[PDB]
Amino acid sequence: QQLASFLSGTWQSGRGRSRLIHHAISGEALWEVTSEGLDMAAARQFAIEKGAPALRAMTFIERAAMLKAVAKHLLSEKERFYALSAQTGATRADSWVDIEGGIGTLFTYASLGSRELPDDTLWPEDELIPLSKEGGFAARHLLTSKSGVAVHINAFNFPCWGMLEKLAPTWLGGMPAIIKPATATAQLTQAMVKSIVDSGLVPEGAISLICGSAGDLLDHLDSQDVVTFTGSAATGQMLRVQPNIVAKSIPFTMEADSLNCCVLGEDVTPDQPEFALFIREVVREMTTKAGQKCTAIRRIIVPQALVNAVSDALVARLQKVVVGDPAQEGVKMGALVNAEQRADVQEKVNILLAAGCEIRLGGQADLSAAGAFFPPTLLYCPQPDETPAVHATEAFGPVATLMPAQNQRHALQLACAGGGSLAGTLVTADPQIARQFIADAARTHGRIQILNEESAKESTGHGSPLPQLVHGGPGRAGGGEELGGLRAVKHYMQRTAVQGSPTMLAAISKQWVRGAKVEEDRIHPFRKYFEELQPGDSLLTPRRTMTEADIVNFACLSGDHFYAHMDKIAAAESIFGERVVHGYFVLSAAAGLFVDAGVGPVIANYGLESLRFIEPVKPGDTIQVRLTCKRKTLKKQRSAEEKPTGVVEWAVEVFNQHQTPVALYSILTLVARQHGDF
Ligand X SMILES: NC(=O)c1ccc[n+]([C@@H]2O[C@H](COP(=O)([O-])OP(=O)(O)OC[C@H]3O[C@@H](n4cnc5c(N)ncnc54)[C@H](OP(=O)(O)O)[C@@H]3O)[C@@H](O)[C@H]2O)c1
| Contacts to ligand X by CB under 6 A | 153-157, 162, 180, 182-184, 213-214, 230-232, 235, 238-239, 255-257, 294, 396, 422, 471-472, 477-478
CB atoms within 10 A of CB 37: 10
* Residue 642 DSSP one-character state: S
Residue 597 or 640: the one with the smaller Cβ distance to a copy of itself is 597
Burial tier of 599 (Cβ tally within 10 Å: 0-12, 13-18, 19+): exposed
Check if the beta carbon of residue 631 is closer than 8 Å to that of residue 654.
no
Minimum CB–partner distance for residue 110 and a copy of itself (Å): 17
- Catalytic residue, candidates 160, 165, 211, 255: 255
Q: Which of these is catalytic: 160, 294, 416, 629?
A: 294
Interacting span for ligand CO8 (CB under 6 A) from 51-59, 100-108, 211-219, 607-615: 607-615
How many chain residues touch ligand CO8 (CB under 6 A)?
A: 22
Query: What angle (nearest 5°) sits at the alpha carbon of residue 166, between those of residues 165 and 172?
Result: 95
**Does residue 122 contact residue 181 with C-beta atoms inside 8 Å?**
no
77 is catalytic: no
Nearer to ligand X, 232 or 622 (CB): 232
Which residues contact residue 568 at a Cβ distance below 8 angstroms, ignoring those fewer than 6 apart?
579
* 146 binds a copy of itself per the rule CB under 8 A: yes
Given a contact cutoff of 8 angstroms between Cβ atoms, the answer to whether 433 and 263 are in contact is no
Amino acid type, 491: H
Strands 297-301 and 399-403: parallel
Q: Output 375 or 649, the one with its CB closest to a copy of itself.
A: 649
Which of 105/633 has CB closer to ligand CO8? 633
CB of 499 to a copy of itself, least distance (A): 4
Measured in Å, how far apart are the chain's first and last C-alpha atoms?
45
Binding segment for a copy of itself (CB under 8 A), chosen from 206-214, 249-257, 352-360, 389-397, is 249-257
When the beta carbons of 200 and 559 are compared against a copy of itself, the nearer one is 559
Least Å distance between CB 258 and ligand X? 6
Partner that binds at residue 484, options ligand CO8, ligand X, a copy of itself, none, CB closer than 5 to 8 Å by kind: a copy of itself
Do the beta carbons of residue 6 and residue 34 sit within 8 Å?
A: no
In terms of Cα–Cα distance, which of 147, 196, 142, 191 is closest to 167?
A: 196
On whether the CB atoms of residues 24 and 338 are closer than 8 A, the answer is yes
Q: What are phi and psi of 609, to 5 degrees?
A: -80, -60
| Contact flag: residue 272 with a copy of itself (CB under 8 A) | no
Distance CA 654, CA 661 (A): 6
∠ Cα 233 235 240 (to 5°): 90
Binders of a copy of itself: how many residues, by CB under 8 A? 135
Instruction: Let me know if 357 is a catalytic residue.
Output: no
* Whole-number Å distance between alpha carbons of 353 and 380: 9
Binding residues for a copy of itself restricted to 386-425, rule: CB under 8 A: 419-420
The reply to whether 634 sits near ligand CO8 by the rule CB under 6 A is: no
With respect to ligand X, which residue has the nearer C-beta, 230 or 387?
230
* Nearest distance from C-beta of residue 633 to ligand X, angstroms: 32
Residues 252, 239: Cα–Cα separation, whole Å: 9
Pick the closer one to ligand CO8 by CB: 223 or 605.
Answer: 605
Residue 457 interface partner, choices ligand X, a copy of itself, ligand CO8, none, CB cut-off 5-8 Å depending on type: a copy of itself
Residues that bind ligand CO8 (CB under 6 A): 115, 562, 564, 575, 580, 582-583, 591, 595, 602, 604-606, 612-614, 616, 661, 664, 667, 669-670
